[PDB]
Amino acid sequence: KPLVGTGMERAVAVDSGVTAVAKRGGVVQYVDASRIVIKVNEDEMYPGEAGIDIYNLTKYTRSNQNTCINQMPCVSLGEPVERGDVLADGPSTDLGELAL
Amino acid sequence: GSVTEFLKPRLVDIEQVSSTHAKVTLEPLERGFGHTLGNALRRILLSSMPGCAVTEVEIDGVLHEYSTKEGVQEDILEILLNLKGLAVRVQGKDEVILTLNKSGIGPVTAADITHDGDVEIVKPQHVICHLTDENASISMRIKVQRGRGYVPASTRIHSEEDERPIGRLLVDACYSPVERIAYNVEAARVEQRTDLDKLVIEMETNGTIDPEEAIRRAATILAEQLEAFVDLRDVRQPEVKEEKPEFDPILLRPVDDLELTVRSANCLKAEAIHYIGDLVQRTEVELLKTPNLGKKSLTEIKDVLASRGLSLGMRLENWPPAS
Amino acid sequence: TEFLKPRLVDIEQVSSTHAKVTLEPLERGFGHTLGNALRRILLSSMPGCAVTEVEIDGVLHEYSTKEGVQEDILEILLNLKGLAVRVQGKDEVILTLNKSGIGPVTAADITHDGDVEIVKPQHVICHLTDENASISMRIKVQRGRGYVPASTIGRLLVDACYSPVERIAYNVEAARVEQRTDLDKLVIEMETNGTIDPEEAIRRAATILAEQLEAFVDLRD
Amino acid sequence: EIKELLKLGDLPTSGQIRLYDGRTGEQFERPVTVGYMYMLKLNHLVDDKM
Amino acid sequence: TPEEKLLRAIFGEKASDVKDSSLRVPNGVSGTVIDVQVFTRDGVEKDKRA
Amino acid sequence: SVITVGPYLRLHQCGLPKKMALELFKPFIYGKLELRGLATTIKAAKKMVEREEAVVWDILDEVIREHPVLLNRAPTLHRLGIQAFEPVLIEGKAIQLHPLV
Amino acid sequence: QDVVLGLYYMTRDCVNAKGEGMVLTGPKEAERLYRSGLASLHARVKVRIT
């Protein structure tokens, strides 16, 4: 994460699909370099058709400029998270805050 | 010889603030020397210091360093990066293989490593992994060596282990145990004269080395290097290498280059036949009397030798010149 | 496992005083460390004898003038700074210079002492104009260390040059070793006087540096 | 406010700081500027451009 | 060429009616293989490794 | 290649990368190799430089000795757009230049 | 730029500040500079120029 910043870089990273932002807020059940699964918890869907939410998160793939584009989980296991915050980080970023 | 006055420096109180930070004070010093020895000791300490570091790591179920593993929150690259800063102090060896097995939920530190009698670990609280599911388990083999001055994996392209298995992951080496080195002159209140200074050396390491052998090894390097500043014979190199190979350079290559069966390779390794320079001048008479060497092996040898142009059981009574 | 030693060594003496020495096989920073170390030793930690006090008859203060002399007192003292003195075995010796007439007042006009050895006898000190001119002075030579400045009746203070080395320079220059790549080759350029040759000068500096630090060596292995 | 931040954690409220060479170890004549700038390695680079 | 015919005759012919066009990593670069892949034609003997 | 400042250079010298100069003076290295010895033939020299074998570098140090290499920049406005220098082998992949010219 | 600023700093007569007119002869002044004591941009000071 960049020391002297502008505050805008926290928006940029999450505005681009580069980082995995939580679709529905709940509690983290399983963390892994491979994936992250969260348990909906607070207010799921209309039908009681199971909570949970699995995020596969791509890793170590090539970019159009042959740059390493991979995602890393910044949230630890059994950690509560709301709707719309970074669960898995991406390339050139630091948990929501962009870092080039 | 009978000239000059001069004085001599000596070690005083080595204030050990922490396991990493340290302070080495040299009181018996004049004005010029107190400031001169500062840069010499500083540089030789910030670079030309020993220390141990991880070079190779072999993890089960992991081929390359760009892969992952189930139940491991950190990726292989991050795990290797954590093994980079592993404070290890080996007793009396130049290479040790630390085994690390650990399973179940929870963080895997340097404590989970099998405590060897030779290996002294400074910080067993060092984070290495973070196993998630209780059914997750890891077992890696770590290799630590004694060295000096960086030297990554890019340096050794393949000048070590002709085969070297796929699982082995090369990690860059940070040999120097010293993080930072500072020093201050300061006027010394030596209860004696009046114009003397005390070279205060502020030191910060990783705890894998003590200020005693640290400063002494440093000054030792300085002395050994100043040794060549005594006499100046201006010794030159003879050079003039010989440029006339009496025989074919291929005969200088080992039998491995023949690329034959394992049985024949073991037979040649048992009959004291290392290079092809010995196999090229060995008759079938001697090859038949070789243990576990039959028609198949003999045909194998003659084929792999004839294909390279060479023959079997020739004579070149000129073996080997001439270093 | 340890380290290597410098093998290729070249020395060219552009005369008896000016010389160049090059040592090629050296590791990182060592060329600069030894450079600064030897420099700080050669520019102060060297012995040598130099003029420290001057007592001229008719002259009590440095801002006075001499009669029959083409050069004023400051220039005289300045020329005295360039007097190379080699004393046998004394920490202090007084010299007397008496000369009258016309022409150059050289060091050969100084009273030939048994212990005191003047390196350059043709070293010009003064200039006398008329026949009725004459000068008599007492030049005190002492054994000291480094460069003693003006910071230290009839006793004229003069900057003492307790050093036989005039200037010291050194270069880094990356060395092209046939095995490694990040190696440097120290090139030390020395300009000295006549009290000592650069050959034994550098060796003396190295040994002087060798006296220190040595208490932290030990052997056995 | 930058000067205000230069305190608190204790720092010369001017950005200036006297540095030592490292080679000679002697102090530099003038106090230099020392700090932390967020730099980034661009694309292009060598290897390709050679 | 006659000289080449003699040359192989002195070291063994094996003059295969085949050439060579294997994919080699370009001189200069160097790294680790992380993933292989093979897209076979629809109607061609699939490979062992494939 | 990308240029870089070289303060330790003289006015008649330029920093020429090792691998770069190796590929450039290929035919010269071949000839000098076969001339001295080492390589039994031309193809031997090729195989010998293709397998950068220490000694080849020293031979390179012989061929680039007083063999000038002329450098050139993109926008060549005047005659001083192309100037010659004596090649100095540099462990790197960038080309170093004298800060005066 | 760089070198010129250097030689510009190698002039620039500054009054006093470890100055004084301690005279010598050219090259010897180098020894004076490395051995501290005197500054560098003083004072002015007199010397013998050949």
UniProtKB/Swiss-Prot annotation, chain B:
Q: Domain notes, please?
A: The N-terminal domain is essential for RNAP assembly and basal transcription, whereas the C-terminal domain is involved in interaction with transcriptional regulators (such as CRP) and with upstream promoter elements.
Sum up the protein's function in the record's words: DNA-dependent RNA polymerase (RNAP) catalyzes the transcription of DNA into RNA using the four ribonucleoside triphosphates as substrates. This subunit plays an important role in subunit assembly since its dimerization is the first step in the sequential assembly of subunits to form the holoenzyme.
Q: What gene name is given for the protein in this entry? A: rpoA
Which parts form a coiled-coil structure per UniProt?
Answer: none
Q: Kindly list the residue ranges recorded as spanning the membrane.
A: none
Q: Which family does it belong to?
A: Belongs to the RNA polymerase alpha chain family.
- Recorded protein name is DNA-directed RNA polymerase subunit alpha
Keyword entries, A-Z: Acetylation, ADP-ribosylation, DNA-directed RNA polymerase, Nucleotidyltransferase, Transcription, Transferase
Record note on quaternary structure: Homodimer. The RNAP catalytic core consists of 2 alpha, 1 beta, 1 beta' and 1 omega subunit. When a sigma factor is associated with the core the holoenzyme is formed, which can initiate transcription. Both the N- and C-terminus interact with different regions of transcriptional regulator CRP. The rRNA transcription and antitermination complex (rrnTAC) consists of RNAP, NusA, NusB, NusE (rpsJ), NusG, SubB, ribosomal protein S4, DNA and precursor rRNA; S4 is more flexible than other subunits.
From Swiss-Prot, chain D:
The family assignment reads: Belongs to the RNA polymerase beta chain family.
Q: Which modifications occur after translation, per UniProt? A: Acetylated on several lysine residues in the presence of glucose.
Q: Give the protein's biological function.
A: DNA-dependent RNA polymerase (RNAP) catalyzes the transcription of DNA into RNA using the four ribonucleoside triphosphates as substrates.
The record's gene field reads: rpoB
Q: What is this protein called?
A: DNA-directed RNA polymerase subunit beta
Q: Which organism is it from?
A: Escherichia coli (strain K12)
Q: How does it assemble?
A: The RNAP catalytic core consists of 2 alpha, 1 beta, 1 beta' and 1 omega subunit. When a sigma factor is associated with the core the holoenzyme is formed, which can initiate transcription. The rRNA transcription and antitermination complex (rrnTAC) consists of RNAP, NusA, NusB, NusE (rpsJ), NusG, SubB, ribosomal protein S4, DNA and precursor rRNA; S4 is more flexible than other subunits. In pull-down experiments interacts with CedA.
The source's domain of life comes to Bacteria
Q: How is it used?
A: Co-administration of salinamide and rifampicin or salinamide and myxopyronin suppresses the emergence of resistance to both antibiotics.
N6-acetyllysine is found on K7
Swiss-Prot record, chain G:
Outcome when changing Q1P: Resistant to antibiotics salinamide A and B
To what use is this protein put?
Co-administration of salinamide and rifampicin or salinamide and myxopyronin suppresses the emergence of resistance to both antibiotics.
What does the entry report about post-translational modification of this chain?
Acetylated on several lysine residues in the presence of glucose.
Sequence similarity:
Belongs to the RNA polymerase beta' chain family.
State whether it acts alone or in a complex, and with which partners, per the record: The RNAP catalytic core consists of 2 alpha, 1 beta, 1 beta' and 1 omega subunit. When a sigma factor is associated with the core the holoenzyme is formed, which can initiate transcription. The rRNA transcription and antitermination complex (rrnTAC) consists of RNAP, NusA, NusB, NusE (rpsJ), NusG, SubB, ribosomal protein S4, DNA and precursor rRNA; S4 is more flexible than other subunits.
Biological function: DNA-dependent RNA polymerase (RNAP) catalyzes the transcription of DNA into RNA using the four ribonucleoside triphosphates as substrates.
Q: What name goes with this protein?
A: DNA-directed RNA polymerase subunit beta'
- Originating organism: Escherichia coli (strain K12)
